[PDB]
Write a protein that binds this DNA or RNA. Structure first.
Ligand SMILES: [Mg+2]
Length: 1310
RNA sequence: AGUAGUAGACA
């Protein structure tokens, strides 16, 4: 009933006071926060920092290791097999036993080789044996492992084993010999890595000859395949049962030997696989200084590497290193083609590929940090004004331990000085780009070559708490200095006029807040009805827990335990706990009323990102989520009506909106300006633009949340009262003070440290009880993004109003874009046309008339614009970053996107590289669909069709080897099915090879429908046995879909159906999953069919619906699987385990294949199946085949005219659950719940009448039948492309554009 | 010995 809360009275702020304050503030010279970019300045910065660096860190004489694996190749590489491994291992051990060991590592490999060569015939039989026929032996306990006890170890090998189970220096970058040595070493490595050892046709001319056929002969290519084999062996050894034993593998005809030492299993957290590599000395990933030993022979040298301990993250990174480098070099290839208008030469391509492969091999945190610095440094020295001195000072705040670090520093220094001298010379080549986009993209690809979360876990666990503790302490000092009331309620403007120090972060001006709210109300009042309806269109009377966001599997804080930590749970568990302990299902406002007295609590956990410092995100408790949901719903509803706020936009509508803003800015500058003159005359003026790509320093931490309260009390909503407004203000008051708990991991770490250094003592003092402290003002990051972004928009509008009042004679222009801590400001200013006469005189006349603030607009008035905008933003506790903010007349950066004028450049390599890590863990069909979907998303984001096709091939191959369905593997369909690999349905291991264009247009499930059409046509034409077999396979798939339940249906949708996979089974079975028996759950699902499409709105039925949710196969899998645990997928999927679902039991994929074959061979085509398949072929091809028909029928001819590049532009591709619920509703509670869910309960029947007819026409099926509509319903619930300028928004034109871009350098006419 | 680190770790 929206309980009445205390409101806040206005204070009557006057815009005249702020205008006169700005008049005074602009009469003095103001120091610009940025520095001009010149070659001499950057050179001086580098020189000073380089000379000062030697005092920061102790002298180091030995460069540290940078290569994770050391190996070498002299000949072409062949993939390893079992027999090949056996013969290679025998030959390699024969070679090794003839060498002389001197280091303990050489002694250890000698002992391992002796033990392996002294293994019997039976041991060699059990060794290499598949899991089907493996039998335990005295020496061999696992298929690929042997035992090597201490009775068979020398003194040196045992010494090495003891070594394994036992301030930071830096090199001299200032030294000119250290740089030379590092450059020589890295250059030698790179040079030896380059040593040579319809769309399909276009791919053949271009992507094969100049990209694939060039890099296929390189040493890097074959070394990458060898690294894949070695990492596959190490992954196989990392199993929970195999890891405690020794292992010996050989590659390249016995030239490379991998010795795997006993290791902690990689299924555990914080474990390392330990291994040694012994190889023949030659070209490749060789670092002689960091090699453990070199054993000489009769003109043969054998490099023995150190013992390397590698974690799961780096091992999985190394496993896909070849594909990573390949996609990176292909992206570089396309970008070079776009920039230079020509294909790169062979030497440059080989160099780029070797550089990418070296970067992917060296998965080290320090190189990642260096590249993270570089991706910000490059925009700094390429701008007009930037914080490049601070960025260069930050680049030197690190020790350079490895040779690669010194080499990269050398290259970075050279590139930055050359850039600031000015044409964009490349960082990893010797080409001169014409566009800054080519350069920034290339270095961003280099940055994305590093996997996320390479940081040290223990250090980062503290580094994520440090900032929150520090800024809470700062807030405490501010409260002590100025008083609690002044800090919380803000300072008045008359106080700022007396104390100019008041303008700083965590302090705000009440007058500024009110004036900004007035400026926003000037827009909000012209759409009062729209704003009010949007507010009322929220979940204000809907029950709280009947929302998907309220029962999700995302993290949640529980209650303070006996030890004092905050519990870890998920949202659904807390929802079920509250519902069990409650009597009804409360509303959002009711839930806030019940839990208002409890206090906001939070924890911080790692985000696991690839930045130099890992930011952490906060997990709060339930009442905190209620308060935040109230505030964020209110402010999202209000902010949807503001065009300068960009979080409220869609996922990719932001790019379109910022494009429109840029067109407005460029249209304003197209023209001229006129300044009236004393004697009714006019001084002409030229319009100019200046973009500020701005970041915000400590956007949430250095903030005061109370500033929102008054803002909320003054923002215009069309509601007829203040009840909801007062509730939002109350909720904001209830998040002002929060409990911040430290993680138990950091707590135990500090508890294990005995004595404490002073900084750790200062950090620990923030927590009085030792577990949680109190944070004021700071709204936790990602909790009030919409509110704070709208507040920043309001402050920008306040600056606009103040500046307009300041200079009514000046017709300046302003465009503002806010996305929280990201901002894009566009200042349109005026310059004298001819010389400066009649303008300097005019400004002097204005000064002589008392308008002293005109001193700021004498020259470069955009500087004064930014100064005043920054000051007014600081009035609202918003600091523009002095380092991360760039100022430029041409180039802008916003939302990870680069603009040059109005052009758009989105980095598509990020999602392309993430496709290689795409693993939903739900099945072969689902994972293939996800990978292809991400490749299609890359195509929409600017990837070329050829590069997208290459990534599609790589991702499909990766998924095929992941699930064992590729030819020669155990789950290959051809071994058990009487059909071909390409004629098999995809859910049954069918071939995933499919062109990118059809996936982009037709869809993801096109392959199964095409196979169904082929089988139907064959059977209806000549009645083959093979076509009847394929139809029987489709029938078998349809049976499996019927065996499942409607409420258990996730992932991609296939009408034919697919196998159901359960992959991860928890050992604890979760909480609240046993209060209702399985029989009860299935009977309830049988007798309550309305709830397979809607959520129950009553507590009694919603508790059952939620307890049933904890037993979904896709829920227990997703509630226990982590991002890298795809490691386990190499054992229980490829080698195969009890994963798939068949006949109400969990079996292997092999059992599913056998059952499919048996059902398909004994299959007869009936009339019902005939009609069903006919409808499927005649209804899904009425639109999808038209895409295939459009692509096949069209013809492309290559015009001899050379391709012309152009600026890119973003174009567009131009409730039902309640309906099924109403259809299936029988009981009174089901009807009530579907009426509540439905927005228009009265029209529902008519809607149902429209649903039956619409499906009967478009889908050719009647929803009156239960099974048909049950199959149809998942599909009934159903894009922005970066193209060239001439392409229109019609969906028939974007496919045409893709066909035109089928060739990278040639023009195509259709 | 590795990863990591001017927060003491894996161990
Ligand atoms: Mg920015």
């Amino acid at each position: 009933y929206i309980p009445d809360y205390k409101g806040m009275e206005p204070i009557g702020a006057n815009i005249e006071d702020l205008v006169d304050y700005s008049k005074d503030w602009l009469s003095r010279a103001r120091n610009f926060s940025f520095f001009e970019v010149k070659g001499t300045a950057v050179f001086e910065c580098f020189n000073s920092n380089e000379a000062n660096h030697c005092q920061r860190y102790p002298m180091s004489r030995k460069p540290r290791n940078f290569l994770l694996i050391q190996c070498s190749l002299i000949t072409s590489y062949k993939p390893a097999t079992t027999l090949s491994d056996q013969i290679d291992s025998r030959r390699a051990c024969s070679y090794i036993l003839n060498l002389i060991p001197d280091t303990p590592a050489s002694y250890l490999i000698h002992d391992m080789a002796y033990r392996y060569i002294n293994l019997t015939r039976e041991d060699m039989i059990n060794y290499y044996a598949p899991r089907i026929q493996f039998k335990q032996t005295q020496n061999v306990r696992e298929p690929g492992t042997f035992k090597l006890t201490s009775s068979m170890l020398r003194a040196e090998s045992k010494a090495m084993l003891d070594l394994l189970n036992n301030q930071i220096e830096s090199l001299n970058i200032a030294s000119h010999i250290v740089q030379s040595e590092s450059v020589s070493l890295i250059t030698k490595i790179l040079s030896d890595l380059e040593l040579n050892i319809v769309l399909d046709k276009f791919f053949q001319n271009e992507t094969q000859k100049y990209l694939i056929d060039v890099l296929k002969k390189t040493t890097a290519w074959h070394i990458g395949h060898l690294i894949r084999d070695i990492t596959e062996s190490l992954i196989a050894h990392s199993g929970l049962k195999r890891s405690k034993y020794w292992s010996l593998h050989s590659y390249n005809n016995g030239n490379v030997i991998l010795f795997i030492l006993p290791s902690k299993s990689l299924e555990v957290a914080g474990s390392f696989i330990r291994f040694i590599t012994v190889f023949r000395i030659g070209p490749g990933l060789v670092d002689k200084d960091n090699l453990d030993t070199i054993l000489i022979d009769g003109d043969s040298q054998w490099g023995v590497s150190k013992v390397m301990s590698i974690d799961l993250n780096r091992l999985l990174a190394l496993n896909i290193a070849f594909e990573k480098a390949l996609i990176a070099t292909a992206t570089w290839f396309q970008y070079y083609t776009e920039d230079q208008g020509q294909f790169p030469l062979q030497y440059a391509i080989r160099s780029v590929f070797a550089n990418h492969f070296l970067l992917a091999i060296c998965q080290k945190m320090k190189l990642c940090a260096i590249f993270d610095n570089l991706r910000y440094l490059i925009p700094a020295v390429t701008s007009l004004y930037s914080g490049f001195p601070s960025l260069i000072e930050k680049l030197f705040e690190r020790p350079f331990k490895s040779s690669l670090e010194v080499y990269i520093y050398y290259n970075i220094k050279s590139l930055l000085v050359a850039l600031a001298q000015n044409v964009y010379p490349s960082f990893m080549s010797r080409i001169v780009y014409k566009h800054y986009r080519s350069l920034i993209s290339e270095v961003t690809t280099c940055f994305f070559l590093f996997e996320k979360g390479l940081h040290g876990n223990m250090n980062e666990e503290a580094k994520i708490h440090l900032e929150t503790v520090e800024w809470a302490l700062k807030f405490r000092e501010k409260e002590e200095k100025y008083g609690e009331s002044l800090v919380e309620n803000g300072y008045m403007m008359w106080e700022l006029r007396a104390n100019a120090e008041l303008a700083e972060q965590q302090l705000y001006c009440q007058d500024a807040i009110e004036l900004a709210a007035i400026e926003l109300n000037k827009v909000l009042a012209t759409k009062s009805s729209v704003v009010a309806n949007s507010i009322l269109s929220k979940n204000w009377e809907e029950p709280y827990f009947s929302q998907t966001r309220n029962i999700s599997l995302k993290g949640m804080s529980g209650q303070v335990q006996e030890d004092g930590h905050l519990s870890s749970s998920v949202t659904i568990i807390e929802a079920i706990r509250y519902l069990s302990n409650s009597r009804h299902n409360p509303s959002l406002l009711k839930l806030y009323e019940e839990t208002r007295e409890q206090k906001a609590m939070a924890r911080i956990v790692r985000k696991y990102q690839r930045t130099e410092a890992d930011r952490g995100f906060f997990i709060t408790t339930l009442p905190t989520r209620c308060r935040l949901e109230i505030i964020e719903d209110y402010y999202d509803a209000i902010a949807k009506n503001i065009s300068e706020e960009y979080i409220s936009y869609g996922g990719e509508k932001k790019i379109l909106a910022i494009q429109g803003a840029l067109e407005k800015a460029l249209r304003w500058a197209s023209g001229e300006s006129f300044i009236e003159l004393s004697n009714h005359k006019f001084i002409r003026m030229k319009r100019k633009l200046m973009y500020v790509s701005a970041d915000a320093t400590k956007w949430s931490p250095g903030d005061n949340s109370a500033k929102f309260r008054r803002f909320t009390s003054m923002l215009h909503n069309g509601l007829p009262n203040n009840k909801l407004k007062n509730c939002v203000i109350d909720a904001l008051k209830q998040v002002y003070k929060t409990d911040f708990f430290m993680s138990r991991k950091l707590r135990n770490y500090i508890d294990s440290m005995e004595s404490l250094d002073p900084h750790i003592k200062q950090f620990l003092d923030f927590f009085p009880d030792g577990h949680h402290g109190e944070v004021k003002g700071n709204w936790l990051q990602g909790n009030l993004n919409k509110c704070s972004s709208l507040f920043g928009v309001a402050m920008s509008l306040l600056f606009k109003q103040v500046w307009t009042n300041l200079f009514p004679e000046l017709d300046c222009f302003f465009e503002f874009a806010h996305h929280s801590d990201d901002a894009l400001f566009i200042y349109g200013y005026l310059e004298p046309v001819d010389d400066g006469t009649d303008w300097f005189l005019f400004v002097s006349q204005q000064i002589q008339a008392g308008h002293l603030h005109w001193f700021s607009v004498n020259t470069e008035m955009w500087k004064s614009m930014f100064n005043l905008h920054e000051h007014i933003l600081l009035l609202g506790s918003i600091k523009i970053s002095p380092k991360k903010t760039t100022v430029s007349p041409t180039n802008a950066e916003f939302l990870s996107t680069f603009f040059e004028g109005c052009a758009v450049s989105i980095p598509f390599v990020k999602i392309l590289l993430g496709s290689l890590s795409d693993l939903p863990g739900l099945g072969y069909f689902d994972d293939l669909a996800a990978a292809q979907s991400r490749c299609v998303k890359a195509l929409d984001l600017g990837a070329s069709p050829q590069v997208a096709q290459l990534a599609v091939a790589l991702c499909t191959s990766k998924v095929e080897r992941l699930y064992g369905t590729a030819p020669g593997m155990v789950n290959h369909p051809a071994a058990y099915l009487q059909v071909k690999h390409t004629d098999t349905p995809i859910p049954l291991g069918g071939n995933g090879a499919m062109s990118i264009m059809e996936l982009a247009t037709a869809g993801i499930g096109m392959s199964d429908k095409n196979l169904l059409k082929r089988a139907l046509l064959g059977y209806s034409h000549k009645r083959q046995k093979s076509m009847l077999y394929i139809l029987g396979l489709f029938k078998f798939l349809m049976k499996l879909s019927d065996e499942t339940f409607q409420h258990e249906r996730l992932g991609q949708f296939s009408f034919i159906g697919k196998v159901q996979w359960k992959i991860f089974t928890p050992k604890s079975e979760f909480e609240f999953a046993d209060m209702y028996t399985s029989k009860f759950l299935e009977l309830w699902s049988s007798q309550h069919v309305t709830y397979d499409y809607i959520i129950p709105k009553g507590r009694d039925n919603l508790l059952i619906y939620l307890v049933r949710k904890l037993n979904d196969p896709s829920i227990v899998t997703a509630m226990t699987m982590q991002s890298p645990l795809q490691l386990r997928f190499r054992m229980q999927a490829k080698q195969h385990m009890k994963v798939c679902r068949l006949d109400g039991e969990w079996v292997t994929f092999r059992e599913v294949l056998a059952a499919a074959n048996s059902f398909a061979e004994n299959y007869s085509a009936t009339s019902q199946d005939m009609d069903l398949f006919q409808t499927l072929t005649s209804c899904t091809f009425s639109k999808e085949y038209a895409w295939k028909d459009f692509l096949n029928g069209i013809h492309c001819d290559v015009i001899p005219t050379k391709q012309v590049q152009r600026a890119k532009v973003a174009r567009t591709f131009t409730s039902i659950p309640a309906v099924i619920g109403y259809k299936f509703a029988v009981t009174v509670e089901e009807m009530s719940d579907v009426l509540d869910t439905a927005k228009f309960p009265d029209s529902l029947s008519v809607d149902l009448k429209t649903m039956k007819d619409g499906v009967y026409r478009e889908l050719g099926l009647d929803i009156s039948l239960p099974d048909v509509m049950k199959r149809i319903a998942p599909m009934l619930y159903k894009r922005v492309v970066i193209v060239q300028g001439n392409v229109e928004g019609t969906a028939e034109a974007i496919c045409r554009y893709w066909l035109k871009s089928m060739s990278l350098v040639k023009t195509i006419r259709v």
